[PDB]
Amino acid sequence: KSVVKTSLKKNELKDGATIKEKCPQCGNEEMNYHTLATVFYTCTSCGYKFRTNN
Amino acid sequence: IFVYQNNITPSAMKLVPSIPPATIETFNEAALVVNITHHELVPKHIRLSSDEKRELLKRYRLKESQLPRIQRADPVALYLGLKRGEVVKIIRKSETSGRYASYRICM
Amino acid sequence: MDISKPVGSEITSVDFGILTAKEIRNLSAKQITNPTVLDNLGHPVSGGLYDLALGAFLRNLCSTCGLDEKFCPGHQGHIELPVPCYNPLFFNQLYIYLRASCLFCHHFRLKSVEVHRYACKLRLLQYGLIDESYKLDEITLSSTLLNELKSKRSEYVDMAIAKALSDGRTTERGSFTATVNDERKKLVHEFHKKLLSRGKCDNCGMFSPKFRKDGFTKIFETALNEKQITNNRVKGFIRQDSTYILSTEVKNILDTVFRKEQCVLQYVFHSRPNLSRKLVKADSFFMDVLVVPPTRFRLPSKLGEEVHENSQNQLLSKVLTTSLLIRDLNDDLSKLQKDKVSLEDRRVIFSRLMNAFVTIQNDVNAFIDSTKAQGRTSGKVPIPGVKQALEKKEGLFRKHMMGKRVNYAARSVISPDPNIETNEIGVPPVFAVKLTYPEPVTAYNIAELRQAVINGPDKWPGATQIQNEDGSLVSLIGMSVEQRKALANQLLTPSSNVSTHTLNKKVYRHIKNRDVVLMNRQPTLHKASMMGHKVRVLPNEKTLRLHYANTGAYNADFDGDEMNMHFPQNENARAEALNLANTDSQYLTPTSGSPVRGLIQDHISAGVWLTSKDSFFTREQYQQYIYGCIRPEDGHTTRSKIVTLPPTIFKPYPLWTGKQIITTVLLNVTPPDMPGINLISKNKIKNEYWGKGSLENEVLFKDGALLCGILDKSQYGASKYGIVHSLHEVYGPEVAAKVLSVLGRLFTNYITATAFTCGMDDLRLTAEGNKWRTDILKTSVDTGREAAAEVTNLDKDTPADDPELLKRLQEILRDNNKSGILDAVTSSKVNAITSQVVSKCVPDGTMKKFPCNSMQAMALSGAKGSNVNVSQIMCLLGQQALEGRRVPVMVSGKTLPSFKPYETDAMAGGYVKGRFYSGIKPQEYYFHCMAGREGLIDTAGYLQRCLTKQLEGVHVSYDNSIRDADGTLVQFMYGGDAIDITKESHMTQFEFCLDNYYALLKKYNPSALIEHLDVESALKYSKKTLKYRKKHSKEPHYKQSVKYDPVLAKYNPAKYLGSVSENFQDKLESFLDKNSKLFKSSDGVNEKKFRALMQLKYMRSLINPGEAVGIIASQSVGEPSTQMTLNTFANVTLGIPRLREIVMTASAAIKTPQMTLPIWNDVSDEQADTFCKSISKVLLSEVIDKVIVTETTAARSYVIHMRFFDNNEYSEEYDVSKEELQNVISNQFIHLLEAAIVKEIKKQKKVQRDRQSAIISHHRFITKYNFDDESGKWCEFKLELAADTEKLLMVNIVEEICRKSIIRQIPHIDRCVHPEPENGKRVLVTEGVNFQAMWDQEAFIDVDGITSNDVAAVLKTYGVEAARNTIVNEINNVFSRYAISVSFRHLDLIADMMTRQGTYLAFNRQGMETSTSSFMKMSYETTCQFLTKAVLDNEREQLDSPSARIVVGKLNNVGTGSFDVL
Amino acid sequence: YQRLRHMVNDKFQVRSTGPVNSLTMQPVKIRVGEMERDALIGHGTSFLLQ
Ligand SMILES: [Zn+2]
Ligand SMILES: [Zn+2]
Ligand SMILES: [Zn+2]
């Protein structure tokens, strides 16, 4: 009944800008990431993740 | 072996210890609408002969109780109708290793 | 300690007893009768606490032993008690039996028939026959009959026991374990349950009067009720042939009852078959004496010049004061004549008795347990008692035993040096002077020792003191040269005294380089945090000096944080460190087997330039550096004369390059006899950086020479399958240990030549880079506005000034959710922006390029930082984020006073277009300050402690079974493989192992091994089984032929060649299948030769026996948790809390159980989506459009109109039939509706018409019903109440109801949700757990793939095994989300551990409770509670656990004990 | 630049032996806590822990 968008589909879920990242799992060249300097990584292809504190 | 539909009188439940050595069983219809022995988390189970048993102890030089225990109320145990003191072959599939044998003692 | 003082005697076990006043009197050295402390001369007041009998006091000498204060061990006497005192600890168990017995027959009020059977079953379990205890109750056939059966009990018991004593299943000591310990707890507890459940005496039918105790130990005896006196007297003929009960009174009662009941309680309080054959006595309960510790422990105290009496000595006084006054009050009792005592005079003496008793009974508590004691004068604090002394802080076990102050150690700051050896440590001379070692005088070292003696104390290396054979200690400190000189001449002089002729003098020398020490850094989260290291005194620096690569081990940043030197005093301890925990053996992560050490920073920063194609060198250069690092004066000579490479380029001019160096490096470090490595790998750099057509990303070694690739952390850093990992694998660590150690020295040398630096120029773009950087940032203008219009569902071109637009925003601003919803949308778009500036400008737009650009080179080479840093500091910081949100808005609708309300700009929402280089606007700046404040607030073990404690006894035995110290089996094979975690790595690396085979052949050396091995049966048997599995391949698990067992199961792998995990077996075959081409291209190495060989490695890879994995498993888990301190943003509980639920709680109901539902493939998404709604839970409050109620006033009436939505809609939405909607209200809603209104009031002081008729009938206040039977749009009806009734608020009462409505709920099922098809898996996610209900949905869903977090219910429904499997899965998923790898072996170990009872066991008091091992239960929580039950059962502790070993300071049982000296 | 005063006492402390506790016959106020003790166990080094 509301006039605005309260709902979410799958593709809008892209989180953070993308940077060129070699996926240590699938060898993808792109992984999304977030920070804490603790740097997350998330594969674009297989969705594989890892984090980097260093 | 008997199949009740749902309910049993608790006094009839005391006709359960009626007639050793022979044993008596009454099971739930609904509970049996699904096989537990087929589930991707359910390992296989096989009862053991006493000689196998006496060897295995001798083989590991172990007491009865030193072994891994399984409780008798287990539906699985109930599913094989196993008496206390019995031990059963157990096949676990390791993810690292392959099929991995093991054992538990009916308690 | 002195090893010249050997002790043959040995302490095997400890037993428990209660000290009886009798022996106490026998073993007392004195009684202390006087509350007075000391005379004015300070001498002990006679009959006072400090008497010299208990020991010497000050300069006085002991009365008892006559000894000085030095040699007097002390002595302790007693204090006689005029009144028996309830022992406050026992007071509960003691009070328990009081109610149970019948005061008349002096038996327990239950029939002795039942009393006989337990003791039989008890008797069975002292010898440990568990199922036999089930055989007993199986026998059943008037007092006559009661005799034959209970007699027939005994014969069967002894028969089975004699049968059990025939063989060795149990011996005269009985048999006791955990499953043994189980029922002993269960019965006796439930046995005691029946003690309080028996109303009338089954023996005499009499009624004994009730008793009422206090916490202060005062038991008041409640009088008999008349109906008891009624029945007592009626039975009073049948036996023919609220007031304090005194301590003495209660005693004499059970004295009979004990004489009565001895036979049964004989088994109750004896943990084991009692060979001593002692009889239970009530004396051990009460306290008729008080023993006072020796004066020395009770000596007074002080903070300084002000001296303070010992507090317990005060608690000693009040007992002596209260006693003498009572002992004097008793003097009036006997003088009071029984013919002078009137009937009321009995009460004043009773007023004296109860008075006297409470005080002296309160002193018992106040002395022992102040919690059991009455407070004093409302203040002054409770004086610490002995009970309060035990649990102090962590408890005396934990505070002063489980940890201790120690000697021979120091604490100081550390500082980096590359120059030492990584296994070494820098030593300032200050410590060198102090720390010494008990040098045994020998033949070989004689001259040396003389020198330190000559050196004496203060000349390094010094000799501080000397012990002769007599033990006489000689301090050279005040001793001159010639004084020492003659002594030096005297050191080797023979032994005059006989008893010392087998003894020699010993020396204390300053530490020298040959020595090793032990380091630790607190806190210690894993074993590597403590290591031993070689020693070099460093002249003139005042602090310890450490090498870099060691830092990661101790995880030290050189913050100035201080660590701990440790200097073992004997060679064994010295030996243990050197060859085990020292350095090398630790090289891999116990968890993951991953490289834990390596070069850091500048080192990595260096390698790039050296490996450059621009590296060129003169012979002079070339030679120096080579020798510069190597130092053949080390022990590291492979070849005495230094061996070198020729220059790459002879003419016109001689030249070397950087690569050749590393080869030369390998050249003289590597064993000459053995060939060099061949290795294929890569680096972290793309070849394109260097130019067009470089291969340098690939790394290649051949003949142990460097033919391609630049060095990297991916190589000589910590990385799996790096050269360093490789050389560790191939040659062994000691090589690699040197190998790493060389590099730093070399690189350091190299730095000193060309050095390195950063620059301002480094951070400049070219002109176009900025020109670019403008362009994308320019387009960003209207981004925000567009994001709004879509969310608002407005046209994209809607100008930001539209009121409706502005209105909806304010509307949106009101919602929490919609706000967060807005952000992510905005979040998404701007992210893409960001992904453009950086992608274009770095590296292509930089003024300096790699490799000259040091800022890039550091990040690129992963030396430090990532593209993120440089990118954000050069391209821009992009949009800020706060916990997955934008900046919270002031309720004004303004982000910030610089912004008008409801602005569309992302910058207005925290989108940072600046870069640290070009500076940031204040608004921008003020934002980032918030983001900074995050982690701080965010930054603002106890778990793991629990784990380790319970897991101490975990160890490997030789049989490869995993055992506790009691030998209980856990895992038949360790990991189902038994492969060590460390060696595990290269097993699956075949191609590497294919190469190097000859060298690989060198290391393993199959030659000598043949004598000890069967080469056949496994292989024969294996291939046999292989066929079956091949034959049986595709059938499901329960169909699998059980004929042939895993080869490992039939064969000790250590004993037999070929006993193998089939996966490994299979992979090998899969490998050998396609890789056969290599054996052609090979050197002639035969697949057979290869197949056979690899098997060896596998069998070489077996874990050692006696390894304690539990600790290794313990640290493996608790330690990495620290990094989970933060979290990102299903939605289950995460981090430690989710963990704690699993391990800590073993929670029955977790907050968020989720059934995992896979479905059949044939079903479409719609149908499931449809189906999802079906099983989903519905509520009335959901479907209600609006409610309108009307009240009027002949009576107080209420007309109630409800408006719903369009029938189809929710009928589509929530899958609703108006009939239910009708029926639901038609039944449950109404019944609820008039219901509360009554309480509310009470608080104040055609067919429709027929359908309308029934409800009105069943329910009082309904005068009308109506509903919309077509559109369903509304329901409406009328109610009425008494006219006089004052106003009620209808809306809210009704408001409450519909939210409590249940239009259609599911059996323990709440919401189902369809997630995304991860990993090609098609599943539904739910909350709540019911298997049965789901078992009907099978058309949509396969059953066998259903999983849940509910594991208890799984255990409930499916039993233990499957449940265990889930346990692992979940726990993994934790670290999985955190991307943290852990050996499943740890997990399975943890898994199989909690399942050993087939039940689901946390780690806590409960999980620990079952421990046969006691002291471990003691030091854990409560020193007293467990302590009680121990003496109650009179347990002998077998000294299995390390904890106990520590308690007595004893050797590992276990750790070395698996090994035996001969 | 600027020079912090000590927030920490850089002073080391070193004891081979010395005066001991009267209660426990132990070194009076280095303390080796539980987890410290716990490490040797994973190493399996008994006589060190002894
Ligand atoms: Zn990935
Ligand atoms: Zn003495
Ligand atoms: Zn009685």
Short mmCIF file of N, CA and C in Angstrom, two decimals, chain C residues 32 159 304 388 439 491 551 625 706 735 753 818 1109 1117 1130 1177 1361 1415 1426:
data_model
loop_
_atom_site.label_atom_id
_atom_site.label_comp_id
_atom_site.label_asym_id
_atom_site.label_seq_id
_atom_site.Cartn_x
_atom_site.Cartn_y
_atom_site.Cartn_z
N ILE C 32 44.93 -25.76 72.99
CA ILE C 32 44.94 -24.33 73.22
C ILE C 32 43.63 -23.94 73.87
N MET C 159 27.17 -64.93 42.65
CA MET C 159 27.41 -65.82 41.52
C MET C 159 27.98 -65.05 40.34
N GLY C 304 54.07 -3.42 56.75
CA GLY C 304 55.22 -2.57 57.00
C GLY C 304 55.51 -2.56 58.49
N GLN C 388 36.96 -19.32 52.71
CA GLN C 388 37.25 -18.15 51.90
C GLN C 388 38.71 -18.13 51.45
N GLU C 439 77.03 -25.52 36.88
CA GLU C 439 78.00 -26.26 36.09
C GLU C 439 78.51 -27.47 36.86
N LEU C 491 89.44 -26.97 42.82
CA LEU C 491 88.15 -27.40 42.30
C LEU C 491 88.16 -28.87 41.90
N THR C 551 59.25 -12.17 14.90
CA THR C 551 58.19 -11.34 15.45
C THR C 551 56.83 -11.97 15.24
N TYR C 625 79.28 -9.33 -1.56
CA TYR C 625 77.95 -9.66 -1.09
C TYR C 625 77.83 -11.14 -0.79
N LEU C 706 67.90 -20.26 -10.37
CA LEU C 706 66.79 -19.36 -10.68
C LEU C 706 66.83 -19.02 -12.15
N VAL C 735 68.02 -26.92 6.92
CA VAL C 735 68.41 -26.25 5.69
C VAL C 735 67.63 -24.96 5.55
N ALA C 753 73.64 -0.83 0.11
CA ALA C 753 74.15 -0.29 -1.13
C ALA C 753 73.21 0.72 -1.75
N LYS C 818 12.80 2.01 5.63
CA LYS C 818 12.89 2.66 4.33
C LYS C 818 14.16 3.49 4.22
N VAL C 1109 47.04 -34.08 21.13
CA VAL C 1109 46.43 -33.25 20.11
C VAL C 1109 45.46 -32.27 20.73
N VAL C 1117 41.51 -23.62 17.92
CA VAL C 1117 40.17 -23.08 17.82
C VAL C 1117 40.04 -21.75 18.54
N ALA C 1130 18.60 -14.84 6.41
CA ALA C 1130 19.51 -15.50 7.33
C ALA C 1130 19.62 -14.72 8.63
N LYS C 1177 3.30 -18.79 8.39
CA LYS C 1177 2.36 -18.44 9.45
C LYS C 1177 1.59 -17.17 9.12
N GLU C 1361 24.67 -39.87 15.73
CA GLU C 1361 25.70 -39.78 14.70
C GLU C 1361 25.44 -38.63 13.74
N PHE C 1415 40.55 -33.59 40.74
CA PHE C 1415 41.19 -32.29 40.94
C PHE C 1415 40.86 -31.34 39.80
N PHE C 1426 32.74 -29.86 45.02
CA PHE C 1426 33.29 -31.14 44.62
C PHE C 1426 34.05 -31.80 45.76
#
